Each structure stands twice: as structure tokens, then as C-alpha cells.
Amino acid sequence: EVQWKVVEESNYSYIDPTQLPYDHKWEFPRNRLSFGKTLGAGAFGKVVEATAQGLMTVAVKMLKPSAHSTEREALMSELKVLSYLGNHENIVNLLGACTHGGPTLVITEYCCYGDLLNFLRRKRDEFVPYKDFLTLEHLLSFSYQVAKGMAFLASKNCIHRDLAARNILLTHGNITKICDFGLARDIKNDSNYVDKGNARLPVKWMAPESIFNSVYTFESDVWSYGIFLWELFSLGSSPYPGMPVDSKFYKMIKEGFRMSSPEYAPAEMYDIMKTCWDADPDKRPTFKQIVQDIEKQISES
């Protein structure tokens, strides 16, 4: 299941998120919700735009009527993980929840510009590196904010496992927020997810140890962040463009093959990508190092 995991020292192992506590401070009166347009939908759930009276415009995640018992539990565990993580500017934050009086509703922040991938593709022919054009100043800020958000998740012993520009939302003032669609997104319709065994996985974003050894760590999140950077400075291009995921692709990655630098990537940002893609997880930077490195770049700019 492609979703977030909180880990505990064992050497880490995933915690069972059902065992996390749900504090009822999040409880919010169901009747104070006015639902609007459906923002997204998966096989078992959807996110709807809603007006919250006394909490503003919010996003509400809910299950579809065909959801099984395990998915109601999964939505509850999603609420438990968000409540455990706490608040940060660069994640989609929990605002409230409705657990009794009906089916479970998770109330989160609303990001009006949608996911960052479609935004970049939208702005591709309206980009200039320097001077509402998208600029290099914006791409640096986006790289900075996603690194801050990922540093925050890592500091809470949380690993994303699916970091990609499609999972970053953009809101007002060019604030980027990491999110986990979870049950609100069905990956069977997305060609960026590849069948491998029974699983469907974002192979072109995954670290080699994740692909060939099923190992997901803080360091494998850093690898995916490097792919995200490539997406960002290619203005939304697909990674390893024109390459099918086949035996040749896996062999090339295993033998050290990496993408070339995007056209608009500053050399300092390509340096970060290359270190993120080190075959040795121990040689990759941490998200805290990446935050400081990009902070120095923005000062110089």
C-alpha cells in the first residue's frame, strides 16, 4: 500500500497506525459542513471542497459507499497519523474531524492551485529564469519548502515512500504542501505507477534499495526528492523520458545510470540531485542538509 509510515526503533519498523491515539479535540460538528465540488476521487474515497462554519474553505476526505470495513479503519488511521504529526507550514495540515454521528470525515487545509506537477506543466511556456511568469526564484522556493516539509516528516520518524511533484500541493503565496492522498487517489489509472509483483509502484521515483530490496528509509525519501527536483527544473517533465520500465531500465539504474541535468536547473541544484541519487544511502544528504544548502543558494541569488 503506497502511503506514509511512521517508524519506531526496533533498525526501524513501521508502526501499526491503528495503535496511535486519536485525541477528540479534533472533533468538529458535522452539521457545520457545507459540501461543494468534488476535488478528487479514488476507488474507495474522495476529497470534496467544503465550507467550515466556525473552524473558511477546507478539503474533506471521506469514503465512498462501497468501502469495506478495512478502509474505514484506514481512514481512521490516516486521521491518527495526521494528529500525531502535528502542524507544519509545508504539509497539508489536519484541521478537524467528524468520527461520530455518521461516516468518518477528515477536515484538512485546502490548496487552490492543485498539485504542483500540473501547475508546472501549465506554466511551462510562461517561464523565464529571471525577470505572472514562473521564475527560477519560484523553483528555488519550491525546492526549499518541500525540503523543509520533508525534514519535518523525517523529524517525526515518518517516511513518505511516494514523494513526487504529483503529491505536492500549491496554495496562495506560493506555499507548497506535501500530502498523502491515500484512499482519495487510485493509482491504477496513472501510468507513472508500474505493476511489479502484485504491487503498483512509482518505480521511476524509487531508490534502488526500495526497488531491488524492498527497503524504505529516510534515505530512500531523499532519492525521491532528487527525482522531484528533476521534475521541478524540467518544468514538469516525466522522469527518464521515453524509457519504458523493463529489464534494461533496472539494469541501468543498478549500474549507476542517472538522468542528465534539466535545462533550467542551476548547477548547484543539479549537484544536489546527483548526491540524492548516490547508490550508497549513507552518502546521500539529509533533508536538513538540503534545507541549509538551498538556503545558501537563495541568499546568493
GROMACS .gro file of C-alpha atoms in nm:
model
  301
    1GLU     CA    1   0.000   0.000   0.000
    2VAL     CA    2   0.153   0.328  -0.123
    3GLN     CA    3   0.119   0.564   0.177
    4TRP     CA    4   0.305   0.724   0.468
    5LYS     CA    5   0.458   0.523   0.752
    6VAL     CA    6   0.570   0.621   1.100
    7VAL     CA    7   0.862   0.409   1.217
    8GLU     CA    8   0.994   0.307   1.559
    9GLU     CA    9   1.335   0.181   1.664
   10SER     CA   10   1.347  -0.199   1.662
   11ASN     CA   11   1.684  -0.079   1.269
   12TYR     CA   12   1.335   0.066   1.227
   13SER     CA   13   1.000  -0.094   1.157
   14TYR     CA   14   0.663   0.051   1.061
   15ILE     CA   15   0.426   0.117   1.347
   16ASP     CA   16   0.069  -0.006   1.319
   17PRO     CA   17  -0.112   0.329   1.278
   18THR     CA   18  -0.433   0.191   1.434
   19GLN     CA   19  -0.240   0.191   1.764
   20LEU     CA   20  -0.186   0.568   1.753
   21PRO     CA   21  -0.415   0.776   1.977
   22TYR     CA   22  -0.698   0.988   1.841
   23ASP     CA   23  -0.746   1.299   2.054
   24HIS     CA   24  -1.109   1.413   2.047
   25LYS     CA   25  -1.001   1.779   2.043
   26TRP     CA   26  -1.017   1.739   1.664
   27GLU     CA   27  -1.389   1.657   1.673
   28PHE     CA   28  -1.599   1.907   1.479
   29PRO     CA   29  -1.979   1.931   1.441
   30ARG     CA   30  -2.083   1.756   1.122
   31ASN     CA   31  -2.377   1.994   1.069
   32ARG     CA   32  -2.142   2.293   1.026
   33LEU     CA   33  -2.013   2.150   0.695
   34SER     CA   34  -2.149   2.268   0.360
   35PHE     CA   35  -2.009   2.049   0.083
   36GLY     CA   36  -1.918   2.179  -0.261
   37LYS     CA   37  -1.739   2.038  -0.565
   38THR     CA   38  -1.553   1.707  -0.562
   39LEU     CA   39  -1.181   1.787  -0.587
   40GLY     CA   40  -1.063   1.428  -0.640
   41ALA     CA   41  -1.172   1.069  -0.610
   42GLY     CA   42  -1.023   0.721  -0.596
   43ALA     CA   43  -1.172   0.374  -0.600
   44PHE     CA   44  -1.283   0.392  -0.236
   45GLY     CA   45  -1.281   0.759  -0.138
   46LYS     CA   46  -1.287   1.122  -0.242
   47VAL     CA   47  -1.189   1.471  -0.130
   48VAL     CA   48  -1.458   1.738  -0.154
   49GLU     CA   49  -1.436   2.114  -0.119
   50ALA     CA   50  -1.634   2.234   0.181
   51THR     CA   51  -1.719   2.545   0.381
   52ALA     CA   52  -1.648   2.520   0.754
   53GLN     CA   53  -1.850   2.747   0.983
   54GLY     CA   54  -1.657   2.845   1.295
   55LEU     CA   55  -1.339   2.644   1.239
   56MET     CA   56  -1.329   2.905   0.583
   57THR     CA   57  -1.282   2.678   0.281
   58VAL     CA   58  -1.149   2.329   0.361
   59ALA     CA   59  -1.096   1.991   0.197
   60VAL     CA   60  -1.288   1.697   0.344
   61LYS     CA   61  -1.175   1.339   0.283
   62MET     CA   62  -1.439   1.067   0.303
   63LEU     CA   63  -1.506   0.713   0.187
   64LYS     CA   64  -1.734   0.605  -0.094
   65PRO     CA   65  -2.036   0.386  -0.010
   66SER     CA   66  -1.865   0.070  -0.144
   67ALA     CA   67  -1.576   0.089   0.104
   68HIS     CA   68  -1.507  -0.225   0.307
   69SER     CA   69  -1.451  -0.238   0.683
   70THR     CA   70  -1.072  -0.224   0.646
   71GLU     CA   71  -1.089   0.106   0.457
   72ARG     CA   72  -1.299   0.277   0.724
   73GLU     CA   73  -1.021   0.167   0.959
   74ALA     CA   74  -0.761   0.303   0.714
   75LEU     CA   75  -0.926   0.646   0.704
   76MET     CA   76  -0.925   0.645   1.084
   77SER     CA   77  -0.554   0.559   1.082
   78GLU     CA   78  -0.492   0.843   0.836
   79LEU     CA   79  -0.652   1.079   1.089
   80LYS     CA   80  -0.438   0.929   1.367
   81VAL     CA   81  -0.117   0.984   1.168
   82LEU     CA   82  -0.203   1.346   1.085
   83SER     CA   83  -0.289   1.413   1.451
   84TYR     CA   84   0.039   1.253   1.560
   85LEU     CA   85   0.249   1.452   1.311
   86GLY     CA   86   0.133   1.791   1.428
   87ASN     CA   87   0.139   2.114   1.235
   88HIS     CA   88   0.385   2.239   0.974
   89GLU     CA   89   0.351   2.503   0.704
   90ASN     CA   90   0.474   2.274   0.425
   91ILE     CA   91   0.237   1.981   0.477
   92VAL     CA   92  -0.138   1.967   0.428
   93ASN     CA   93  -0.244   2.008   0.789
   94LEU     CA   94  -0.525   1.846   0.983
   95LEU     CA   95  -0.792   2.096   1.086
   96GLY     CA   96  -1.071   1.884   1.235
   97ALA     CA   97  -1.257   1.558   1.205
   98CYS     CA   98  -1.603   1.403   1.230
   99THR     CA   99  -1.591   1.050   1.374
  100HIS     CA  100  -1.933   1.004   1.542
  101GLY     CA  101  -2.281   1.076   1.412
  102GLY     CA  102  -2.203   0.916   1.077
  103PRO     CA  103  -1.920   0.811   0.846
  104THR     CA  104  -1.572   0.942   0.912
  105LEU     CA  105  -1.473   1.281   0.768
  106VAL     CA  106  -1.118   1.421   0.775
  107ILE     CA  107  -1.100   1.801   0.753
  108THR     CA  108  -0.774   1.933   0.607
  109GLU     CA  109  -0.634   2.252   0.459
  110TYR     CA  110  -0.739   2.343   0.104
  111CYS     CA  111  -0.482   2.426  -0.167
  112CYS     CA  112  -0.642   2.618  -0.451
  113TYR     CA  113  -0.375   2.565  -0.720
  114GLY     CA  114  -0.390   2.185  -0.718
  115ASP     CA  115  -0.091   1.956  -0.744
  116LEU     CA  116   0.245   2.104  -0.835
  117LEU     CA  117   0.307   1.875  -1.135
  118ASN     CA  118   0.008   2.001  -1.335
  119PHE     CA  119   0.096   2.356  -1.226
  120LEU     CA  120   0.447   2.329  -1.373
  121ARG     CA  121   0.314   2.178  -1.695
  122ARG     CA  122   0.060   2.461  -1.707
  123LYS     CA  123   0.332   2.726  -1.666
  124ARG     CA  124   0.593   2.561  -1.890
  125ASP     CA  125   0.566   2.806  -2.183
  126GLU     CA  126   0.532   3.103  -1.944
  127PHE     CA  127   0.864   3.050  -1.764
  128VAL     CA  128   1.160   3.288  -1.770
  129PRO     CA  129   1.465   3.224  -1.548
  130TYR     CA  130   1.490   3.591  -1.446
  131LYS     CA  131   1.265   3.895  -1.488
  132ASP     CA  132   0.288   3.648  -1.366
  133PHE     CA  133   0.579   3.448  -1.508
  134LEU     CA  134   0.712   3.147  -1.324
  135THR     CA  135   1.077   3.219  -1.246
  136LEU     CA  136   1.386   3.049  -1.111
  137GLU     CA  137   1.315   3.232  -0.785
  138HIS     CA  138   0.990   3.034  -0.759
  139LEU     CA  139   1.153   2.698  -0.833
  140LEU     CA  140   1.418   2.760  -0.567
  141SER     CA  141   1.149   2.847  -0.311
  142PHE     CA  142   0.953   2.533  -0.404
  143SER     CA  143   1.264   2.316  -0.363
  144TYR     CA  144   1.327   2.485  -0.028
  145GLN     CA  145   0.975   2.438   0.107
  146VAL     CA  146   0.947   2.073   0.005
  147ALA     CA  147   1.282   2.005   0.173
  148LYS     CA  148   1.157   2.179   0.489
  149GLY     CA  149   0.836   1.977   0.486
  150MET     CA  150   1.029   1.654   0.433
  151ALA     CA  151   1.273   1.749   0.709
  152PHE     CA  152   0.970   1.792   0.934
  153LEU     CA  153   0.828   1.450   0.843
  154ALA     CA  154   1.168   1.288   0.899
  155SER     CA  155   1.199   1.457   1.240
  156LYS     CA  156   0.870   1.287   1.334
  157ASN     CA  157   1.011   0.946   1.226
  158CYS     CA  158   0.780   0.947   0.923
  159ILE     CA  159   0.878   0.830   0.574
  160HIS     CA  160   0.671   0.931   0.277
  161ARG     CA  161   0.752   0.649   0.028
  162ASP     CA  162   0.583   0.830  -0.263
  163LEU     CA  163   0.745   1.173  -0.284
  164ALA     CA  164   0.677   1.327  -0.626
  165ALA     CA  165   0.558   1.654  -0.776
  166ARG     CA  166   0.212   1.498  -0.816
  167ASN     CA  167   0.194   1.474  -0.434
  168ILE     CA  168   0.282   1.840  -0.364
  169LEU     CA  169   0.001   2.095  -0.349
  170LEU     CA  170   0.041   2.468  -0.414
  171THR     CA  171  -0.161   2.732  -0.229
  172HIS     CA  172  -0.168   3.113  -0.205
  173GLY     CA  173   0.158   3.298  -0.168
  174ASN     CA  174   0.341   3.010  -0.344
  175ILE     CA  175   0.337   2.784  -0.037
  176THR     CA  176   0.395   2.418  -0.129
  177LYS     CA  177   0.246   2.149   0.097
  178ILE     CA  178   0.330   1.779   0.097
  179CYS     CA  179   0.033   1.545   0.118
  180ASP     CA  180  -0.075   1.180   0.111
  181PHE     CA  181  -0.388   1.131  -0.099
  182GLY     CA  182  -0.429   0.779   0.036
  183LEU     CA  183  -0.777   0.650  -0.043
  184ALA     CA  184  -0.860   0.964  -0.246
  185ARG     CA  185  -0.633   0.852  -0.532
  186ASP     CA  186  -0.645   0.527  -0.729
  187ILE     CA  187  -0.305   0.458  -0.886
  188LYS     CA  188  -0.435   0.201  -1.138
  189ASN     CA  189  -0.525   0.492  -1.371
  190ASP     CA  190  -0.178   0.653  -1.353
  191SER     CA  191   0.093   0.538  -1.594
  192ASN     CA  192   0.352   0.675  -1.350
  193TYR     CA  193   0.278   0.371  -1.131
  194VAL     CA  194   0.409   0.037  -1.261
  195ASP     CA  195   0.295  -0.318  -1.190
  196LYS     CA  196   0.566  -0.516  -1.010
  197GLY     CA  197   0.451  -0.839  -0.850
  198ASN     CA  198   0.106  -0.777  -0.708
  199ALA     CA  199   0.203  -0.420  -0.619
  200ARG     CA  200   0.172  -0.097  -0.817
  201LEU     CA  201   0.474   0.121  -0.752
  202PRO     CA  202   0.621   0.456  -0.865
  203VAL     CA  203   0.934   0.288  -0.997
  204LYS     CA  204   1.094   0.591  -1.164
  205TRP     CA  205   1.087   0.777  -0.829
  206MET     CA  206   1.213   0.491  -0.610
  207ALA     CA  207   1.562   0.438  -0.471
  208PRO     CA  208   1.741   0.122  -0.589
  209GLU     CA  209   1.725  -0.040  -0.245
  210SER     CA  210   1.348   0.013  -0.249
  211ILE     CA  211   1.314  -0.149  -0.593
  212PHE     CA  212   1.553  -0.442  -0.555
  213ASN     CA  213   1.548  -0.496  -0.177
  214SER     CA  214   1.207  -0.358  -0.059
  215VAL     CA  215   1.392  -0.118   0.174
  216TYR     CA  216   1.218   0.213   0.254
  217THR     CA  217   1.409   0.456   0.476
  218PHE     CA  218   1.466   0.826   0.536
  219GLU     CA  219   1.746   0.794   0.280
  220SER     CA  220   1.516   0.648   0.014
  221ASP     CA  221   1.290   0.952   0.058
  222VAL     CA  222   1.594   1.168  -0.025
  223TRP     CA  223   1.641   0.976  -0.351
  224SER     CA  224   1.279   1.050  -0.447
  225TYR     CA  225   1.334   1.415  -0.356
  226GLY     CA  226   1.612   1.424  -0.616
  227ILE     CA  227   1.369   1.293  -0.877
  228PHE     CA  228   1.123   1.562  -0.763
  229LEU     CA  229   1.394   1.825  -0.820
  230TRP     CA  230   1.439   1.692  -1.173
  231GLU     CA  231   1.063   1.723  -1.231
  232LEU     CA  232   1.074   2.074  -1.088
  233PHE     CA  233   1.357   2.213  -1.300
  234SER     CA  234   1.235   2.032  -1.613
  235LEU     CA  235   0.903   2.218  -1.565
  236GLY     CA  236   0.702   1.902  -1.511
  237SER     CA  237   0.868   1.658  -1.749
  238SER     CA  238   0.832   1.288  -1.679
  239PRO     CA  239   1.147   1.127  -1.533
  240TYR     CA  240   1.368   0.913  -1.758
  241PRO     CA  241   1.165   1.043  -2.054
  242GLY     CA  242   1.089   0.791  -2.327
  243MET     CA  243   1.224   0.500  -2.124
  244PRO     CA  244   0.994   0.203  -2.061
  245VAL     CA  245   1.028   0.033  -1.723
  246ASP     CA  246   1.179  -0.300  -1.831
  247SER     CA  247   1.476  -0.523  -1.753
  248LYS     CA  248   1.712  -0.281  -1.930
  249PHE     CA  249   1.593   0.011  -1.716
  250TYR     CA  250   1.650  -0.175  -1.388
  251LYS     CA  251   1.994  -0.287  -1.503
  252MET     CA  252   2.095   0.069  -1.599
  253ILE     CA  253   1.986   0.212  -1.263
  254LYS     CA  254   2.166  -0.071  -1.083
  255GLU     CA  255   2.487   0.001  -1.277
  256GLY     CA  256   2.482   0.374  -1.193
  257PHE     CA  257   2.275   0.531  -1.471
  258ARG     CA  258   2.118   0.866  -1.374
  259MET     CA  259   1.928   1.140  -1.555
  260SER     CA  260   2.104   1.435  -1.716
  261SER     CA  261   2.059   1.785  -1.577
  262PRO     CA  262   1.733   1.963  -1.666
  263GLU     CA  263   1.765   2.261  -1.898
  264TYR     CA  264   1.677   2.521  -1.631
  265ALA     CA  265   1.846   2.359  -1.330
  266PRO     CA  266   2.124   2.570  -1.177
  267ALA     CA  267   2.445   2.371  -1.142
  268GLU     CA  268   2.412   2.390  -0.763
  269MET     CA  269   2.069   2.225  -0.782
  270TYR     CA  270   2.195   1.951  -1.013
  271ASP     CA  271   2.473   1.887  -0.760
  272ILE     CA  272   2.201   1.819  -0.503
  273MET     CA  273   2.021   1.579  -0.739
  274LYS     CA  274   2.339   1.381  -0.801
  275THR     CA  275   2.408   1.337  -0.429
  276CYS     CA  276   2.043   1.241  -0.368
  277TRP     CA  277   2.094   0.967  -0.629
  278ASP     CA  278   2.406   0.816  -0.471
  279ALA     CA  279   2.389   0.437  -0.487
  280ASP     CA  280   2.514   0.436  -0.126
  281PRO     CA  281   2.230   0.558   0.101
  282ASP     CA  282   2.487   0.671   0.358
  283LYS     CA  283   2.639   0.922   0.113
  284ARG     CA  284   2.310   1.095   0.035
  285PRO     CA  285   2.242   1.425   0.214
  286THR     CA  286   1.979   1.451   0.480
  287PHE     CA  287   1.680   1.679   0.430
  288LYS     CA  288   1.829   1.910   0.694
  289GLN     CA  289   2.148   1.943   0.487
  290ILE     CA  290   1.937   2.011   0.177
  291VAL     CA  291   1.742   2.286   0.355
  292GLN     CA  292   2.066   2.458   0.455
  293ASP     CA  293   2.220   2.417   0.109
  294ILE     CA  294   1.919   2.568  -0.069
  295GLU     CA  295   1.902   2.843   0.194
  296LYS     CA  296   2.256   2.946   0.098
  297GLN     CA  297   2.162   2.940  -0.272
  298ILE     CA  298   1.863   3.170  -0.216
  299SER     CA  299   2.081   3.416  -0.022
  300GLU     CA  300   2.334   3.425  -0.307
  301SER     CA  301   2.058   3.472  -0.568
   0.00000   0.00000   0.00000
